Write a protein that binds this ligand. Structure first.
Ligand SMILES: [Zn+2]
Lengths: 397, 49, 397, 397
């Protein structure tokens, strides 16, 4: 993998630095690395493809070295360099695609493509250059069993889940108490509703709890916490738990009472925020516990009093809410985020070449299913494919 | 190695071995030349001297 | 353009590497590049400005090479370097602004300012250095006819458009069926509404469709698709199509039925997702087709049954909807986005210097108009100004 | 601090470039820099910790220079290098934490830890290397008293503020005119409401204004403006200004007319946008003035007419809202934002080591309070700790 990254990095540096008219002192070391790559690759043959519709291509290498005599690079030098670089970049592209379209249930971190297995040989180790990218750096750290970390903007951690739980219910669904929630990407929206508005609840308070566990531990996360859930604040017709019928939800929003957001790591309270909204920091956690109450307003004006009676015909249903967005985070594992295009690249290559479903990833690289069952084997395969995808995107635009 | 004679210009900032280690592909010769190029004494204070 | 970027990169590397105390071995090659720049630029005269209120300034170059020999840079070396760096930074700033504030209907890509036209001469080619930044990479690739690529976070691909279509209407607007959408930036929010809740529709189903074309093809796009449109789930008073009167919209939200989101390229379905929400991937597409259905709940509790009558007076109007946000994408053409500041920089310079409306861009660089009539000449000029803006931001804060 | 950054930079380069198999020409200058660092740091004794629970650590340096006799670095060379690199990284990490957990009301920009004070000495200036990161570049520019600039995605420039203002009211809270808003992070969401729908207002128009003064001047800001406030478009029950009672708000949303957005600097309108939504640009501003109007629809269909009677008992309350979001901006001072992790890192270190509340920052690094009272001393200390956090984030995952 490091050899593949080195090939990509040296080709990128060659395309950026070997330009007409530049001094040879700007490219002396780069050309030494390039000639080392050419010498190490010459005489070897590779084969990429043969899975799904990905074409089978044979790659041979016989390239003269780049010269070391000009004071300033000229058109001839750049033409030769680019004619070599184009072939090398195509070979890297196809190696990366072949690696991305493959997965393995056992030894998922190891190379899966024939070409990457060949490049894993010691003879190619001389083409190592530097490992400066975040993904390759974490690849090396993971190989060394050292602590890793990827910085994500809006991490796609929570699998899509729009659901509701009812703690009080009747077949008529006319006097309900419960919670509704949407967890998607980096957003949690939870609403606790009570149709009776806690008229008879002890102390005229109804308690609501929402426990969202994560499949991976996040660290140093910035979180925006807002005191309302706009997604559960308008009239709804919702099909019941079993789908046998439908119930009506006509909410009236009150402020959430005694809001407590706890970020727990292995069941230990790492961070706690009481009635604090806005930007907060969770340094280390694997589960989020949102606790909020609906308190019946002790004093009501006539309008609110008419809204909330003491008899069964509850036309308006009291509702409180919380919204929790994860703006940024750090995770020792790989995830999908709103900024990077690695999930997109892997999915796109697989869809384009009609790769059959394998034994590791769910069909079509469905992120919801993957992050719902983020097994260690799936994590190994996902890191491998994402690292090779980043290597590929280093060269392909 | 069948390479063209080194036209080494007097006063060049680099020595012929420094040029040759770059121009030569053979690992044994290149490694030996590199050792000769980067081989230095080491200044060490031993017993106050 | 390449020469201008090389000047900016050389100056930035000079400012970042030539610092007191650093080993001269850390800056030897950079100093050779700096001396090459000074030699190439010496004896040439330039003029910038003369458009709008941008002042006219004349630039001459008579700077000597840096040649002092030391092991670690001292204060004298840094000061001598800084004088030249300051002058060159000012020159590059003014050249970049002069090029940003100019347009051309024909030959948009080509340099417009006289300073940049001079710099495009062959004798200046000896300052190229490394074209590594994304925008200069794409500039060079486009010149070489290779496929380009710009990665955007929340691309601004949709021209702002809030509208509604009434497939069934009366002058009283008591019984309406239709769709209601807002396309803006990277978000589509659409909602079909039916006041009769498909009481008389075939199979008690109403079908709504929404086709959003794109002015440019996006590739490897990750998209979040959620089943409710927040924007159109509240009571509204909306002016009619002709603006003569206003009508009342009082939605009650039902789950969208038989959702089908299709990403099509040249009328061919490239990607399709049925009844799947969360994160999805569209590898290549130029239009989005969202189909959804309002199905009358076959089973309803008394509250819902009262909500939906079969008579005329429709107090609650059945509504379904979808939200679709492009979190990240890749485009062959430049676009605005939420993470870049190039559009902001160009617009800011033009506004500050009161540049008269040119023949290409709309007044005030209005992004809605630009992305609506995103003509080829507009794309050329936009890429030129964005590349210049990136070059300038390399040096200016 | 430049010395600490150079230590971190050289250690990062050693980790990412001293890899098995790499040519020695790829690490020649890096090895020279590393040996320079070892020479300069040999024989110096440092101490870190002592504040809160941060352990007291003593650091001694008696390392040997890296070898230079290998054409290609092999496993033994890498292991030997890592032995010393680990110790240097640990020293840098502890220095960074000790500096982050400290603050000073006077000269908050000056180094606060003994280790950084000692590193500020002249003898350590030899370890300077290249200052290419954004934060160190701004640090050097600020020390030289030059321009400073940080680019923020969704800057956290608005202290959290969710409130309402009543311009017409009475104890019954049944005929209210006013405006309710939420300013949070990078989003302003305001909504002006009138219960009588301007039945008796002059020209059937009610004016609403909302002034948001930023605590720092933003520049080249890309902003999105949308014509509704989704957060104030559903029924709710709000506590009174004094908290004595609660009142009912039942919005019906109309289109805001005569929308004006003014971006002002020192009270002078710098940008003005009238009846324009979507992407807009503010080149230089420190205050945002949002003006909008509730216009009673001159013509209404019966369904609309029934909503707005001319007598007191108003059941539906006319509301018009605006939503403004700063997608991207540039600021001279440091701010938390959606993409960066510096605020999270500083808060995480302080929480983990239980640093007692100091005299500069608010308890727990509460960003709402910090940006509410962002005094010059707080700005200096925050810039210092953010720069140190960025320096630490290139070594610690
Ligand atoms: Zn974002």
């Amino acid at each position: 993998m490091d050899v593949l990254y080195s090939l990509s990095k040296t080709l990128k540096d060659a395309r950026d630095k070997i330009v007409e008219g530049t001094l040879y002192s700007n490219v002396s070391d780069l050309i030494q690395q390039f000639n080392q790559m050419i010498i190490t690759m010459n005489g070897n043959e590779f084969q990429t493809g043969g899975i799904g519709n990905l074409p089978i291509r044979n790659w041979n290498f016989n390239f003269g070295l780049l010269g070391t005599t000009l004071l300033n690079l000229d058109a001839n030098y750049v033409e030769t360099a680019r004619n070599t670089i184009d072939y090398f970049v195509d070979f890297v592209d196809n190696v990366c695609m072949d690696e991305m379209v493959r997965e393995s249930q056992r030894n998922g971190i190891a190379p899966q493509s024939d070409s990457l297995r060949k490049l894993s040989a010691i003879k190619f180790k001389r083409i190592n250059f530097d490992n400066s990218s975040e993904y390759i750096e974490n690849w090396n750290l993971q190989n060394r069993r050292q602590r890793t970390g990827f910085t994500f903007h809006k991490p796609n951690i929570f699998p899509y889940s729009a659901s509701f739980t009812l703690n009080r219910s009747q077949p008529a669904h006319d006097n309900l108490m419960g919670t509704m929630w949407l967890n998607a990407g980096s957003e949690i929206q939870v609403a606790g509703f009570d149709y009776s508005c806690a008229i008879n609840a002890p102390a005229n308070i109804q308690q609501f709890e929402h426990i969202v566990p994560l499949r991976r531990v996040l660290t140093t996360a910035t979180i925006t916490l807002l005191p309302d859930a706009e997604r559960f604040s308008f009239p709804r017709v919702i099909n019941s738990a079993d789908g046998a019928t439908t119930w009506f939800f006509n909410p009236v929003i009150l402020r959430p009472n005694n809001v407590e957001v706890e970020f727990l790591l292995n069941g230990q309270i790492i961070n706690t925020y009481q009635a604090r909204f806005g930007t907060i920091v969770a340094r280390n956690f694997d589960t989020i516990r949102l606790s909020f109450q609906l308190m019946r307003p002790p004093n009501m004006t006539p309008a609110v009093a008419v809204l909330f009676p003491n008899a069964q015909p509850f036309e308006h249903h009291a509702t409180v809410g919380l919204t929790l967005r994860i703006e940024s985070a750090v995770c020792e594992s790989v995830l999908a985020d709103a900024s990077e295009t690695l999930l997109a690249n892997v999915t796109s290559v697989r869809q384009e070449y009609a790769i059959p479903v394998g034994p590791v990833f769910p069909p079509g690289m469905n992120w919801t299913d993957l992050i719902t069952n983020y097994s260690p084997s799936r994590e190994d395969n996902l890191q491998r494919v994402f690292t090779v995808a980043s290597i590929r995107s280093m060269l392909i635009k | 190695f069948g390479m063209q004679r080194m036209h080494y210009r007097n006063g060049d900032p680099q020595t012929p071995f420094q040029i040759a280690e770059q121009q030569i592909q053979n690992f044994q010769v290149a490694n030996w030349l590199h050792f000769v190029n980067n081989n230095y004494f080491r200044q060490v204070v031993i017993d106050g001297v």
